[PDB]
Design an enzyme around this catalytic site. Sequence first.
Site, PDB file in Angstrom:
ATOM      1  N   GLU B 357       0.818  -1.206   0.000  1.00 37.81           N
ATOM      2  CA  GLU B 357       0.000   0.000   0.000  1.00 37.81           C
ATOM      3  C   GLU B 357       0.853   1.257   0.000  1.00 37.81           C
ATOM      4  O   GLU B 357       0.440   2.282  -0.553  1.00 37.81           O
ATOM      5  CB  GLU B 357      -0.964  -0.006   1.186  1.00 37.81           C
ATOM      6  CG  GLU B 357      -1.918  -1.194   1.212  1.00 37.81           C
ATOM      7  CD  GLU B 357      -3.016  -1.131   0.164  1.00 37.81           C
ATOM      8  OE1 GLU B 357      -3.232  -0.061  -0.441  1.00 37.81           O
ATOM      9  OE2 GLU B 357      -3.666  -2.171  -0.065  1.00 37.81           O
ATOM     10  N   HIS B 487     -16.024  -9.329  -8.261  1.00 38.91           N
ATOM     11  CA  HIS B 487     -15.715  -8.404  -9.349  1.00 38.91           C
ATOM     12  C   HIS B 487     -16.734  -8.490 -10.478  1.00 38.91           C
ATOM     13  O   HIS B 487     -17.107  -7.468 -11.063  1.00 38.91           O
ATOM     14  CB  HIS B 487     -14.306  -8.672  -9.868  1.00 38.91           C
ATOM     15  CG  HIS B 487     -13.254  -8.540  -8.816  1.00 38.91           C
ATOM     16  ND1 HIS B 487     -12.895  -9.581  -7.988  1.00 38.91           N
ATOM     17  CD2 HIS B 487     -12.494  -7.484  -8.444  1.00 38.91           C
ATOM     18  CE1 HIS B 487     -11.955  -9.173  -7.156  1.00 38.91           C
ATOM     19  NE2 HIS B 487     -11.693  -7.904  -7.412  1.00 38.91           N
TER      20      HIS B 487
END
Lengths: 201, 596
Positions: B357, B487
Amino acid sequence: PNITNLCPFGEVFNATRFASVYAWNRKRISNCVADYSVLYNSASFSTFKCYGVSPTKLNDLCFTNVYADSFVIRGDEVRQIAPGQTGNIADYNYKLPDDFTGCVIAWNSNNLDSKVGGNYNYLYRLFRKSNLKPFERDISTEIYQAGSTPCNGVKGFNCYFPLQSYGFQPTYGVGYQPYRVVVLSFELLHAPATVCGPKKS
Amino acid sequence: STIEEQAKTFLDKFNHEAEDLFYQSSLASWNYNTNITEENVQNMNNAGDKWSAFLKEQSTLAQMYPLQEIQNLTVKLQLQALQQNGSSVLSEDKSKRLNTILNTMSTIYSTGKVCNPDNPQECLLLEPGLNEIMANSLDYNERLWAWESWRSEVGKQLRPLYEEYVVLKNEMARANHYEDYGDYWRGDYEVNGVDGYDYSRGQLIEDVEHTFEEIKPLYEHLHAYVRAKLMNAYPSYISPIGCLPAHLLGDMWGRFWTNLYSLTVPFGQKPNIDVTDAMVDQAWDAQRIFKEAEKFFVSVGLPNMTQGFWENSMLTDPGNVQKAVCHPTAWDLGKGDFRILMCTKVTMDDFLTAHHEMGHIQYDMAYAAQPFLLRNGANEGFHEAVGEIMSLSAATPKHLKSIGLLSPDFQEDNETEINFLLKQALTIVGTLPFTYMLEKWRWMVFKGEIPKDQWMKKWWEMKREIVGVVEPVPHDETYCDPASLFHVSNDYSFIRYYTRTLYQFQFQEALCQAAKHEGPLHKCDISNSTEAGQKLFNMLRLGKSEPWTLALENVVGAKNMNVRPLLNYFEPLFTWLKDQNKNSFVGWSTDWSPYA
Ligand SMILES: *[C@@H]1O[C@H](CO)[C@@H](O)[C@H](O)[C@H]1NC(C)=O
Ligand SMILES: *[C@@H]1O[C@H](CO)[C@@H](O)[C@H](O)[C@H]1NC(C)=O
Ligand SMILES: *[C@@H]1O[C@H](CO)[C@@H](O)[C@H](O)[C@H]1NC(C)=O
Ligand SMILES: *[C@@H]1O[C@H](CO)[C@@H](O)[C@H](O)[C@H]1NC(C)=O
Ligand SMILES: *[C@@H]1O[C@H](CO)[C@@H](O)[C@H](O)[C@H]1NC(C)=O
Ligand SMILES: *[C@@H]1O[C@H](CO)[C@@H](O)[C@H](O)[C@H]1NC(C)=O
Ligand SMILES: *[C@@H]1O[C@H](CO)[C@@H](O)[C@H](O)[C@H]1NC(C)=O
């Protein structure tokens, strides 16, 4: 001798509110004693870039008038307050001459000029037909004409409003945080120079 | 005066007001995510509606500047990004129907709760109730029950909804001058107007097939090894000649194989590289985890985190009283505000996630100089790939020894490298045929190659042909087995993971060649190398201003996605798997030999 009547640097630097970059405040300082070492030895200023003169001999030299221009800009726009630069602030808001003698003092004011909802009280001129002359102030609020069609006072297609706010929020980056800028302009004219520094005893 | 200067001034005003509105919306989303309260939900919805209405009005105003009278490539790129109709070209009734369908699919997936018949007094949601069962159980009929019951409930709810969804999305896409919705998704990689560096929407499918044809032997050997180990785990269910049963792959859908590492470990007797106990012994706080990640990024030459990052990020779970989303997310809120929202534990996975991240944050910081509408990755693959390369570099034993988390007398022999590479293959190689098969199936659904009565007959046929995974029992057309995944049920492109996986190892070879690493590729660490960081930052600073082909030229020196760095990464494991598969049979049979 015994010295009194200091120049009003408290009403410029320690002002409770500053003007926008477009309607920048100009204060003419005359017939007093200007102690510049108080400003130079402060640790509260991030930029103290002097052009055309050095800060050590400011406290010695004497000038006819001192012009103190005060406004608020972004962190990344402090570099444009310099002779010969370019950007929205120099082209459309506040232009310094190439033959400029004076000092540009800037400091971070995220504590005062930023609120959590967004402070929209500080504005900047985003457009104009031509670049500003040095030490020119444009406070007109006339609709910018980017196209051939006349605006007729309405912000329609190709017609935008010149002044745009900087929504200053405390959680902003250091390049977007508000910076209070005071520009001191020192000129010597054929009139008797009256803004002198303090003389030691 | 001219149209191009008019468009430039329009872009300047756009940029200025957009940046502020996107900031307000992103800050509202942040305040919802760190503080789940109903007024924060209302503030998020108000800010999002203002942002969407502003994008609608600027899309309506950007189209009045014709494209062919603009010669500057960046201005034309921003105007092309702004001038997309989106769903606005569709009628208001059908747009409302599409939005309602998307929202109700989101609610069906999020609030889908399934439990055992005749025991209905309490039930388990997907996360974490069904995830833990799929990832940790060793029982055949329990996993079969969970798999079939969740695809029964979710598919039988979502099948008419998906049948409406494909028609509405195809209508919107053909209203937007695309062939289908698959062409709309493939238009993210379309480069037009650059001499030599042009990339077509039709070249993407050919490049994906061409790369997967080279993926296929490594996946076949990995599939044979996993088949033999699962035959050892489950004695009678798995056939030596057939495909793998679907509910035994360690996850709900077969997305990753990383939960089979315990069953399929080569050398269990050898130790693991787990550093969790070492951080617990040295009392590593989450602040120390992120500071070590920042030390990694300053060692390669990238900029360090701002003061506002440390002030404004939530790097620890707040507590019982305050609720927050646990998913790790890097936030580019705008105006130089960069934050990480992660509920960081003291584990290796959270440490690698912190590196991942913060790689996302570094990528976001690098293109902050770009105009607002160009502040993205060059494609959807690069943004994830630059985080995954940090996850690659931080996981190496050299990095762990360098930061002191691993013992300096830890023996790095070939067996630990083989089992580490097998774990990385179960995470990385195993997702590639599933991703490619899912995107090819969705492309064939949108193109109309597969009629609605033949969706599932083709789909399992694709899964046997590509993934080598067989259905436990046959499914008719009342099921909607693809849309049980997050998704596909929530209208997300899926080829970004395939492209991310290939770009990851391409970037890794380029940076390791820059860093003059002299060993195996998986033993390579990009710390202490200023030139590797410079080669990375040259692409990172561009953002979406340049074509992704030119950015890939800037990093690896190639104009196209390449498969050879991935195969070079897994070459020790490839030789070991070829040695271990001498007696067994590589490849599978599409027949019903294991179970049907
Ligand atoms: C302005 O305020 C600062 C801090 O309160 C103080 O130290 C300083 O003397 C004041 N005046 C000037 C001219 O800077
Ligand atoms: C989270 O929301 C609650 C709702 O009243 C508020 O009291 C609290 O201060 C918020 N937390 C933070 C860190 O702002
Ligand atoms: C395109 O416009 C940008 C400003 O928006 C300018 O800096 C750049 O040089 C222009 N490129 C060309 C090729 O004219
Ligand atoms: C968007 O839609 C309008 C009418 O709905 C159309 O005139 C315009 O050409 C469309 N934009 C593009 C880029 O196709
Ligand atoms: C980032 O690095 C600079 C230069 O090394 C340093 O001055 C600054 O304090 C660092 N930032 C933080 C948040 O420590
Ligand atoms: C590791 O190396 C030793 C000696 O070179 C060899 O005997 C052994 O077979 C190797 N093991 C693997 C898995 O490569
Ligand atoms: C990278 O640099 C840091 C700081 O100089 C140092 O502590 C570390 O040992 C270096 N890495 C290696 C592998 O030597």
